[PDB]
């Protein structure tokens, strides 16, 4: 079946309007993947140590020591908005829909090709490329999710973001258990602190192998491989933002005095002594009913320790937060001006709100007796130092998460954000994930692994440390996916128009190529349109 | 499917006589198309500036500044009479039919082949060509006309005109919005006039991509691609010409005196005083009923400003005209002696009539009072200067188009003329197109795009400005189309014979090859045969 | 009766939106004064040919 294609190229996205403001978005995405022979046909357990870095009292956060099992397989990840939608599409989705539902997903590998490089060592010397018509491309689709979940979006290693630009899969590797101790220290810290990699705990050792836990298919040119259709089990993602804070929840105080002429200084006036007002308060002490005192239903948002690093058996790690900022570093293949030189990533900090965010500088604590103006001794301000440290206040320690905490889930981040994420297999689970807006609880699509089957030479001896020598082979194959969403059309509820993504005299050139054909994909806001929270 | 052809070569034209003087013309045309790897796999936005040319006060019409998006795709255009009929056929159609109807059109791509060039750098050095049996030729047929309409006939870039001569598709590119100002000036104009390219208006930016809006097929040798049958929606094209002008419309004046002996000077005579004649006039003043005064039904033809250039946001452009002359520059592959040297196009000015044409030199205007012989002060002649310019008369400004304008559509121009054209998507539309005799209103065939899929080498890195290096590949494939017309057989209505295309002792050698095998296709008249207009 | 628009280009397009500049052309004032500002209607290119 050499002279016959086994698939079709399709990179169109279709919006099929169903019944009652609900539409069905079908994002088709296909690409040409380039894959090289494994640098090593073996599984390696590799340790990464960098104490020297962390050895510098004050450089703890720069800790990279970990252990990973390097597999001879590559992973074809497409989990990132940039892989399915282009700027124009994102505008549409983001501007006219009000919520998105992730529905199904399927992939296929067609028109497989395997070539061979001959080093025609003549003069220059030359180099030749030929077709190995009988060579095979190994494919494995871990449907039962046996293998560790390794989303490539976290290291900006997904498939390209341009339909017309060949891409490639990423070398697959996963974490291996290890013990490590690193004790905090600042510039002044005396003597060498404790910084040591202890090793591996036998009881947590898990050496995974694809061969052993997943059936492998060998695809020759004539062959093709197709995944079935997976249907997710995720909650709907919203494309609306709330803005209210406890200070804007409920019936505003009745103004007994209203302005009588336009004017920035023409304010209205409640017109009632702060301690002779009616209403509800949760302060059994005072008779003071103020906008900061009046009782609200619950609390929109919470406060958490900032730049807090906790430690467990593998080392320190930043205490994650649900507030509002992700920082995305990437490049060339996923945005970053294509013609850009050097090897410095491009990046952005997607800022998302005032929906649950906090201004620490505005926080403060007072003595139960109240008694204002409050005395310095009865107030702990975000200015008074903790532990004697000049740069540490109670807020860095503070946590106001509790039974009344209201909160929203992560918004979509085009085009660098991950789309769906697998849930933790713990008995109690995170009320949300910080990395993706969609989390398949029970079932998530299985990972797809590719690998160029070993093209041996006439000389091969299993019983020899040597290192099998094989014909230089590589494979190019097309990949095609289909991600289906279900979305609801938004409606206008206010008299005033609203936030909409548009092209300006300023963005204009972030959506077109240049005289050299350089390109780039700029990030974009996703939940632009207020929604009444209460 | 490597060793098996997937199509048939057919370049015959069949005339199937139906019932009642109507015949069905089936023009089959197949060809061998040669296609090379894209010089760039990317889409580029390229600006073309040439102010220096236009900077020469008086060289405005020579303005070429524009912006275009260069796509990595080639377009297979067959829209030109020369692609479907040869001289012999055109004679038949043109000589015996009286009107033509464009009916259907279909294409197919078969016997695809992809080769690879090896630079055997030995001594000379050598060069080698091989078959890439697993390589693919990308094909896209824009059925929904998503892409901008770019007829290749306007730049003489259609498929060849000879069945036995391999041809090639043209690199596809389309216009991109831009702003540009250029102010008129003549040789004497003082100071530098305004000539500037302002840039791009964000609101009119449209970056089109095939990958994103059209499904692509990958054809390997064994594969083949066929379009369905498209049925046009166009008015019938006539193969008859009218000759009457207002001066020949109606009942001629009754001659009271007729000649009595042969003689070029033996004229007939109306025999009635010009102001004592009966009849109808639209001049409420005079009693003068002259052949130039008598009333006619409406007006055959109209007058328009000549060598008028208008300006809109992209620059100046000639004010188009419906009168009677197109100028066709082309070469080698579409006529022009095949063996001709140099790089100077061949060309002709198809002159078409006296059907609606005007002789400005004969125009004149007089004062309502009439009063003849007319006084110089009561006459504006095509001689008296306008604006003081010695070379400008009112006729260059003049426009006599109105509610009584009768007029015919463009005639077919063999073999360089375009056949059908897409209609403008404006609310009000042109009563006709100047470029083709057939205009599909609602539906026009979709454009067919070809492109050699990227043949990568073992070294490929998506995340590198570099410039993907790929194996030198190219493809040859056969193309075959079928354009079907419906025509009516003409009848003899006069006692006298009529204009017919024929071979003379003079054309004779414009229809045969030479001792070297050189060839050429000479243009020919199409509506040769008078038709009564009134 | 209206038809929903589709995205045909790779680039986003002109859309009416609220700015830090129009903002107050869509809300009343302390006196309850109001006003309705005019707006563009056919914002979105269409291929003419």
Could you tell me the CA-to-CA distances from A141 to A147, A151, A409, A524, B253 in Å, in that order? 10, 15, 30, 32, 94
Reading the block at residue A333, the tokens are: 């293949």
Measured between CA atoms, the residue of chain C closest to residue B204 is C45
Counting beta carbons within 10 angstroms of the beta carbon of residue B4, is it exposed (0 to 12), middle (13 to 18) or buried (19 or more)?
A: exposed
Q: How far is CA A479 from the centre of its chain?
A: 23
> Within a 13 Å sphere around the CA of B263, how many CA atoms are in the beta-carbon half?
8
Experimental method: X-ray
Pairing of β B66-75 and β B447-452: antiparallel
Alpha carbons B366 and B380: distance in angstroms, whole number: 7
Chain B: nearest CA to C46, how far in angstroms? 8
Say if CB A365 and CB A394 are below 8 A apart.
yes
Could you tell me the CA-to-CA distances from A250 to A241, A402, A406 in Å, in that order? 18, 21, 15
* ∠ Cα B3 B4 B5 (to 5°): 130
Measured between CA atoms, the residue of chain B closest to residue C11 is B207
According to DSSP, residue A331 is labeled -
- Contacts of residues A453-462 at CB distance under 8 Å and 24 or more positions apart, as own/partner, are A453/A135, A453/A136, A453/A137, A453/A138, A453/A218, A454/A41, A455/A37, A455/A114, A455/A116, A455/A132, A455/A135
DSSP per residue, B30-58: EEEEEEEPPS-SS-EEEEE--HHHHTSTT
Chain C: nearest CA to A34, how far in angstroms? 25
Chain B: nearest CA to C17, how far in angstroms? 14
Query: In units of Å, what resolution does this entry have?
Result: 3.0
Residues of B in contact with C9 (CB under 8 A): 205-208
Tell me the three state secondary structure of residue B394: helix
- Report the candidate in A287, A292, A305, A295 with the shortest Cα–Cα distance to residue A250: A295
Alpha carbons A149 and A206: distance in angstroms, whole number: 14
Residues of B in contact with A160 (CB under 8 A): 462
Size of interface A-C (CB pairs under 8 A): 76
Residues of C in contact with A499 (CB under 8 A): 17-18
Tell me the three state secondary structure of residue A422: strand
Alpha carbons B32 and B49: distance in angstroms, whole number: 36
* ∠ Cα B499 B432 B143 (to 5°): 110
- Report the candidate in A451, A87, A335, A481 with the shortest Cα–Cα distance to residue B463: A335
Alpha carbons B336 and B332: distance in angstroms, whole number: 5
Alpha carbons B17 and B24: distance in angstroms, whole number: 6
Say if CB B396 and CB B341 are below 8 A apart.
no
* ∠ Cα B117 B70 B420 (to 5°): 100
According to DSSP, residue B417 is labeled S
Q: With an 8 Å Cβ cutoff, are C10 and B207 in contact?
A: yes
According to DSSP, residue A38 is labeled P
- Report the candidate in B348, B330, B329, B336 with the shortest Cα–Cα distance to residue B519: B336
Counting beta carbons within 10 angstroms of the beta carbon of residue A98, is it exposed (0 to 12), middle (13 to 18) or buried (19 or more)?
A: middle
Say if CB B396 and CB B505 are below 8 A apart.
no
Q: With an 8 Å Cβ cutoff, are B46 and A515 in contact?
A: yes
Pairing of β A225-226 and β B365-366: unpaired
Reading the block at residue B19, the tokens are: 């019932």
Reading the block at residue B255, the tokens are: 């001659």
**Bridge partners of A31?**
A479
Q: With an 8 Å Cβ cutoff, are C11 and A258 in contact?
A: no
Could you tell me the CA-to-CA distances from C18 to A350, A376, A413, A499, B293 in Å, in that order? 20, 44, 21, 5, 65
**Bridge partners of A299?**
A405
Alpha carbons A219 and A217: distance in angstroms, whole number: 6
Measured between CA atoms, the residue of chain A closest to residue B120 is A126
Reading the block at residue B534, the tokens are: 């009134």
Say if CB A305 and CB A397 are below 8 A apart.
yes
For chain B, how long is the longest CA-to-CA vector? 98
- Report the candidate in A232, A231, A235, A239 with the shortest Cα–Cα distance to residue A488: A239
Tell me the three state secondary structure of residue A396: helix
Chain A: nearest CA to B464, how far in angstroms? 7
The minimal CB distance from C14 to the residues A89, A268, A502 is found for A502
Could you tell me the CA-to-CA distances from B383 to A377, A478, B309, B359, B387 in Å, in that order? 103, 71, 22, 13, 13
DSSP per residue, B329-363: EE-STTSS-TT--TT--EEEE----SSS---GGG-
Reading the block at residue A168, the tokens are: 């490639």
Say if CB A100 and CB A236 are below 8 A apart.
yes
> Can you give the CATH number for the domain in which A355 is found?
2.170.30.10
- Report the candidate in A92, A88, A20 with the shortest Cα–Cα distance to residue A239: A92
Sign for the CA dihedral angle at B224, B225, B228, B234 comes to: negative
Reading the block at residue A498, the tokens are: 């609203």
* ∠ Cα B293 B297 B303 (to 5°): 75
Chain B: nearest CA to A174, how far in angstroms? 23
- Report the candidate in B273, B274, B230, B295 with the shortest Cα–Cα distance to residue B442: B230
> Within a 13 Å sphere around the CA of C8, how many CA atoms are in the beta-carbon half?
14
Q: With an 8 Å Cβ cutoff, are C8 and B213 in contact?
A: yes
Say if CB B158 and CB B80 are below 8 A apart.
yes
- Report the candidate in B195, B120, B89, B169 with the shortest Cα–Cα distance to residue B450: B169
Q: With an 8 Å Cβ cutoff, are A262 and C30 in contact?
A: yes
Sign for the CA dihedral angle at A324, A329, A335, A339 comes to: positive
Counting beta carbons within 10 angstroms of the beta carbon of residue A41, is it exposed (0 to 12), middle (13 to 18) or buried (19 or more)?
A: middle
Residues of B in contact with C13 (CB under 8 A): 203, 205
- Report the candidate in B452, B439, B445, B388 with the shortest Cα–Cα distance to residue B410: B439
- Contacts of residues B501-505 at CB distance under 8 Å and 24 or more positions apart, as own/partner, are B501/B90, B501/B91, B501/B94, B501/B95, B501/B525, B501/B528, B502/B91
Alpha carbons B49 and B69: distance in angstroms, whole number: 15
Could you tell me the CA-to-CA distances from B344 to A279, B50, B326, B327 in Å, in that order? 93, 21, 19, 15
Number of separate domains in chain B = 1
DSSP per residue, B166-208: -B--EEEEEE---EEEE----TT--S---EEEEE--GGG----
Q: After which residues is chain A broken (C to N over 2.5 A)?
A: 324
Could you tell me the CA-to-CA distances from B50 to B64, B174, B195 in Å, in that order? 6, 19, 10
| Sequence-ordered alpha helix ranges (H) in A451-532 | none
Chains contacting chain A through 3 or more C-beta pairs under 8 A = B, C
Tell me the three state secondary structure of residue B241: strand
Phi-psi region of A21 (alpha: psi -120 to 50; beta: other; left: phi over 0): left
Q: With an 8 Å Cβ cutoff, are B207 and A511 in contact?
A: yes
Alpha carbons A125 and A122: distance in angstroms, whole number: 4
* ∠ Cα A86 A152 A451 (to 5°): 105
Say if CB A75 and CB A150 are below 8 A apart.
yes
Q: How far is CA A84 from the centre of its chain?
A: 15
Alpha carbons B4 and B2: distance in angstroms, whole number: 6
Sign for the CA dihedral angle at A403, A404, A408, A410 comes to: negative
Say if CB A181 and CB A196 are below 8 A apart.
yes
Tell me the three state secondary structure of residue A501: coil
Measured between CA atoms, the residue of chain C closest to residue A511 is C11
Q: What are the backbone dihedrals phi and psi of residue A157, each rounded to the nearest 5 degrees, phi first?
A: -130, 35
Residues of A in contact with B70 (CB under 8 A): 517
Mention every residue, 6+ apart, whose C-beta is less than 8 A from residue B248.
Answer: none
Chain B: nearest CA to A510, how far in angstroms? 11
Reading the block at residue A118, the tokens are: 């001959």
Say if CB B54 and CB B182 are below 8 A apart.
yes
Sign for the CA dihedral angle at B69, B73, B79, B85 comes to: positive
The minimal CB distance from B222 to the residues A4, A513, A517 is found for A4
**Bridge partners of B171?**
B74
The minimal CB distance from A503 to the residues C6, C14, C16 is found for C14
> Within a 13 Å sphere around the CA of C40, how many CA atoms are in the beta-carbon half?
8
Could you tell me the CA-to-CA distances from B57 to A163, B64, B71, B336 in Å, in that order? 46, 15, 35, 35
Residues of B in contact with C11 (CB under 8 A): 205-207
Reading the block at residue B336, the tokens are: 């022009």
User: Which residue is it, tokens 């007829």?
Assistant: B151
Alpha carbons A118 and B229: distance in angstroms, whole number: 47
User: Which residue is it, tokens 């005196």?
Assistant: B257
According to DSSP, residue A135 is labeled -
Measured between CA atoms, the residue of chain C closest to residue B429 is C48
Residues in chain A: 534
Range of the domain at B192: 1-534
Measured between CA atoms, the residue of chain B closest to residue C43 is B203
Reading the block at residue B334, the tokens are: 């579409």
């Amino acid at each position: 079946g050499v002279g016959i294609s086994t698939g079709t190229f399709n990179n169109q996205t279709e919006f099929k309007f169903l019944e009652n403001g609900w539409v069905e978005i079908t994002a088709n995405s296909s690409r040409l993947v380039h894959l090289n022979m494994p640098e090593s046909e073996n599984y390696k357990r590799v340790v990464v140590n960098n104490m020297d870095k962390t050895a510098v009292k004050g450089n703890m956060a720069l800790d990279d020591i970990h252990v990973e099992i390097v597999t001879p397989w590559s992973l074809v990840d497409a989990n990132a908005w940039g892989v399915w939608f282009n700027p124009g599409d994102w505008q549409l989705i983001v501007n006219t829909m009000s919520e998105l539902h992730l529905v199904s997903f399927e992939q296929e590998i067609f028109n497989v090709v395997l070539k061979t490089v001959s080093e025609s060592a003549t003069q220059p010397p030359t180099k030749v490329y030929n077709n190995d018509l009988t060579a095979s491309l190994m494919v494995a689709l871990d449907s039962n999710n046996t293998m560790p979940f390794t989303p490539a979006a976290m290291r900006s290693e997904t498939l390209g973001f341009y339909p017309w630009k060949p891409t490639i899969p990423t070398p697959w590797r996963y974490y291996f258990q290890w013990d490590r101790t690193l004790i905090p220290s600042h510039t002044g810290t005396s003597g060498t602190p404790t910084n040591v990699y202890h090793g591996t705990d036998p009881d947590d050792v898990q050496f995974y192998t694809i061969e052993n836990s997943v059936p492998v298919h060998l695809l020759r040119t004539g062959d093709e491989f197709a995944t079935g259709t997976f249907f997710f089990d995720c909650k709907p993602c919203r494309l609306t933002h709330t803005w209210q804070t406890n200070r804007a929840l409920g019936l505003p105080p009745f103004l007994n005095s209203l302005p009588q002429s336009e004017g920035a200084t023409n304010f209205g006036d409640i017109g009632v002594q702060q301690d002779k007002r009616r209403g509800v308060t949760q302060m059994g002490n005072t008779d003071y009913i103020t906008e900061a005192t009046i009782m609200r239903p619950a609390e929109v948002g919470y406060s958490a320790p900032y730049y807090s690093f906790e430690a467990s058996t593998q080392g320190p790690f930043k205490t994650p937060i649900a507030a509002g900022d992700p920082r995305y570093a990437f490049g060339r293949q996923h945005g970053q001006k294509t013609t850009t030189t050097g090897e410095t990533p491009e990046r952005f900090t997607y800022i998302a709100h005032q929906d649950t965010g906090r201004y620490p500088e505005g926080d403060w604590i007072q003595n139960i007796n109240f008694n204002l103006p409050v005395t310095n001794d009865n107030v702990l301000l975000p200015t008074d130092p903790i532990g004697g440290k000049t740069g540490i206040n109670y807020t860095n320690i503070f946590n106001t998460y509790g039974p009344l905490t209201a909160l929203n889930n992560v918004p979509p981040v085009y085009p660098n954000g991950q789309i769906w994420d697998k849930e933790f297999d713990t008995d109690l689970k995170p009320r949300l994930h910080i990395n993706a807006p969609f989390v398949c609880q029970n079932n998530c699509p299985g990972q797809l692994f590719v690998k160029v089957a070993p093209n041996l030479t006439n000389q091969y001896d299993p019983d020899a440390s040597a290192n099998m020598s094989r014909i230089v082979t590589y494979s190019d194959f097309w990949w095609k996916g289909k991600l289906v969403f279900k979305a609801k059309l938004r409606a206008s509820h206010t008299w005033n128009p609203i936030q909409q993504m548009s092209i300006n005299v300023d963005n204009q050139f972030n959506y077109v190529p240049n005289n050299i054909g350089a390109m780039k994909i700029v990030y974009e806001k996703s939940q632009l349109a207020p929604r009444k929270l209460y």
